[PDB]
Amino acid sequence: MKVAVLPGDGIGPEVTEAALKVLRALDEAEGLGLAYEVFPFGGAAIDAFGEPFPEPTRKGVEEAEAVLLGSVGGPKWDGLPRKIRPETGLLSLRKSQDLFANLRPAKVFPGLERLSPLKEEIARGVDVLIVRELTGGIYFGEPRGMSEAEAWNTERYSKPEVERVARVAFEAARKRRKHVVSVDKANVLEVGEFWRKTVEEVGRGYPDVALEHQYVDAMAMHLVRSPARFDVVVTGNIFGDILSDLASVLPGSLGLLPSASLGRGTPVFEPVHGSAPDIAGKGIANPTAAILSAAMMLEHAFGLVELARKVEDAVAKALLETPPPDLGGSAGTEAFTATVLRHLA
Amino acid sequence: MKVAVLPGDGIGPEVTEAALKVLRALDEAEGLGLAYEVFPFGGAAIDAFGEPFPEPTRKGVEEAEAVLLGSVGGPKWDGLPRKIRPETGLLSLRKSQDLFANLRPAKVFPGLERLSPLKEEIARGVDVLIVRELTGGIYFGEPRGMSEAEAWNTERYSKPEVERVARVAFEAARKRRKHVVSVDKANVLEVGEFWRKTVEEVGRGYPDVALEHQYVDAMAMHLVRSPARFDVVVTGNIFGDILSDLASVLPGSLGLLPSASLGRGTPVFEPVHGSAPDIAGKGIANPTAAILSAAMMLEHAFGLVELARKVEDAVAKALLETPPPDLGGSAGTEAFTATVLRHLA
């Protein structure tokens, strides 16, 4: 277990140290081979090295088995050249590692339904993982352009692009409830027909996992009326972009959300939230997204699924025993991390 | 007021007769010049005329100032040739009239929050109108295609396409709360930049209406966390397709939803619901979507806004006094239409 730890700016060090305290305690009781190195990343590195993804950091990422990122960005570096912003160094980290699948889970922990915008009955039991394709589709498609009379952009997918993001979904689903919904617009678009066609064939090598297909406009409706029926949801880039934000409002707090980017290189695990300058240094930032990102690392980077689930239960009990300020409690980052560790022991 | 009335199949005649009873009563108290003709449309016309949009119907639509459609479709005509289905004659009706804007409102009437999938506090006061562009974008864009190794489809918009759907949104907003949100993906797509650019300029001729711009992935989140802040929302075809279905789950009943398609020809007004064969003839179908479609006709086809709003209030009181079976009450189509008329008098 060689992890590069890039804490970044704002509350990024704060919540990353909390994730590190959980990983270290877990390494004692279980004897992992946790070996980690902390690096300068974005903003903290613009200050030391004059540039957001400095050469030591790049080597460290390249040499580690997984990255545990915190948060980048901040006022201090906002009006800069777009080349050197903390924020573009984040794109450079994913791009350098050829990360093509973004995994973003939305879970309503037991007893936390009151926070969901949805009624308790509908919010109960939601635990959905949206797998979004990151490297293709309309955001990168050519031809694209704009004249004075019109504009065009191309939604394009090749067969290996679809096959590889669908393999991450089938493999993810195996560790979970073995059900994959693939989302497309196949009744109107040939890219949809193609997508459905390819995932269906990928599904044949995973006979233990059920695959269902749904249209995106109908998935937007199911994610609000009955989100608790889904497990893994895999889709294209623009559709994954809309749907993982829609599912992300269902828990009711930005500090509860972990993410992962898997690909050819070193996988990055990170909180959906940013650097939150307004609450930085106040010792109150909710470390749950970071601790659950570290759990996602145990599961997706090191295949340690029962340990990943042990960390999720400990976090689920902690959120009910001493909730952070953003879920209406009073527990600061330290008091809350300690409740988590109490439930690991 | 010359209306062509195409009741169609299933519960279509049932809920259309209810809309007609409201229009007739209203024509007495106010003295409209309501003159309407009932025509054979889809399914009922495949039986009489062997084809879903027969020549008498086509002439009647063409001669009327507005169309009040009911519902088409049904088992009786399901396995047919795709050329002659009831359902394709519906596409032919919109296409023959050059209808390019689809208007679909989602309203949580007072006291009906309990039906919304969202918590009472969030569901309270939702009254949003999604204006969807119907004729362009990726669903019709060229080039499109599919090889064995890949597929492509083109999201393309011309300047008059955007300008004209945005004009319908600005005009609609004037009769409502004067606020338009335009939805795009302008931080990544040139079609988005173009869309935003053109609506902004259209907005200059409507200085009394506020215009705000939002990204689609962020609109999907706002429509669940705080839908009550919006009034009119105008967007492209694929985005309008996803967002008007997302907003349509917020009331909690398919029988509450009216729609309108405005364009160059004769505007069609219709319930979002279909022909519902399972409850047809049982005298229990909820006529609210049809009565509110007739109200939408008063407002958008004949500019009669205070009369359109009078019908909406009467329907709002009726839903609280004698709710249909689908909102948990016991009132059949007739008993419910009578409560509405009691509140018009």
Ligand SMILES: NC(=O)c1ccc[n+]([C@@H]2O[C@H](COP(=O)([O-])OP(=O)(O)OC[C@H]3O[C@@H](n4cnc5c(N)ncnc54)[C@H](O)[C@@H]3O)[C@@H](O)[C@H]2O)c1
């Ligand atoms: N370059 C880009 O494209 C880009 C894009 C987005 C953000 N950024 C940068 O990153 C920073 C992001 O800050 P922001 O305010 O936009 O978003 P944010 O997600 O950091 O914060 C939003 C809100 O949620 C709260 N929050 C976030 N995490 C929390 C946690 N763990 N516990 C409790 N509360 C939490 C914050 O306090 C704040 O009230 C900015 O300063 C910006 O410079 C850059």
Ligand SMILES: NC(=O)c1ccc[n+]([C@@H]2O[C@H](COP(=O)([O-])OP(=O)(O)OC[C@H]3O[C@@H](n4cnc5c(N)ncnc54)[C@H](O)[C@@H]3O)[C@@H](O)[C@H]2O)c1
């Ligand atoms: N050709 C096409 O592309 C196409 C597409 C969709 C539907 N159709 C046709 O139209 C018909 C649609 O039927 P469906 O079941 O799919 O959808 P539907 O919307 O008619 O019915 C769905 C459910 O909602 C209920 N419902 C609908 N309106 C109601 C109302 N006013 N009051 C109370 N309950 C109501 C129904 O009873 C049913 O339980 C089908 O028979 C089909 O042939 C064709």
